[PDB]
């Protein structure tokens, strides 16, 4: 199965390079990659680099993560905030590793996936699913 993974990847990549899409799960992944790049840009110019702002005390990464996320969606959910959610998680994985804390990377992924499933998914379903997100971020 590892060999087919390599083939579906790359093919997705080469199709995307020509404005095409392997599947529109792959277009979601693509659109979200681009959105994160633009978000991390307009966040940088308006304030500081998101990753530099991160300073994780040892054994407080979960609390740090849950605090920002719970505050981000305190009063509501929207696509632009979900983008912020991914970028912040990405910045946290990059801020980890930098400080030789690679163990956190898998844990962060679990925190993100869990929060996405339980708390954000219901909103996503009512607002036309991830397919809608791609239309707005073409």
């Amino acid at each position: 199965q590892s060999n087919r993974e390599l083939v579906v990847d790359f093919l997705s990549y080469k199709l995307s390079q020509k404005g095409y899409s392997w599947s529109q799960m792959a277009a979601v992944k693509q659109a979200l990659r681009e959105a994160g790049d633009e978000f991390e840009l307009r966040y940088r110019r308006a304030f500081s680099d998101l990753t530099s702002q991160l300073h994780i005390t040892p054994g407080t990464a979960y609390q740090s993560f849950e605090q920002v996320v719970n505050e981000l969606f305190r009063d509501g959910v929207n696509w632009g905030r979900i983008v912020a959610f991914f970028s912040f998680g990405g910045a946290l994985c990059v801020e980890s590793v930098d400080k030789e804390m690679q163990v956190l990377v898998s844990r962060i992924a679990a925190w993100m996936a869990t929060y996405l499933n339980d708390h954000l998914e219901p909103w996503i379903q009512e607002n036309g699913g991830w397919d809608t997100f791609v239309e707005l971020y073409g």
Binding site: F39, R42, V83
Partner: peptide, 16 residues
Amino acid sequence: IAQELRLIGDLFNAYY
């Protein structure tokens, strides 16, 4: 960080 993310987040959403 939380307020800042909410800002660009909300600016993105209102943009489209």
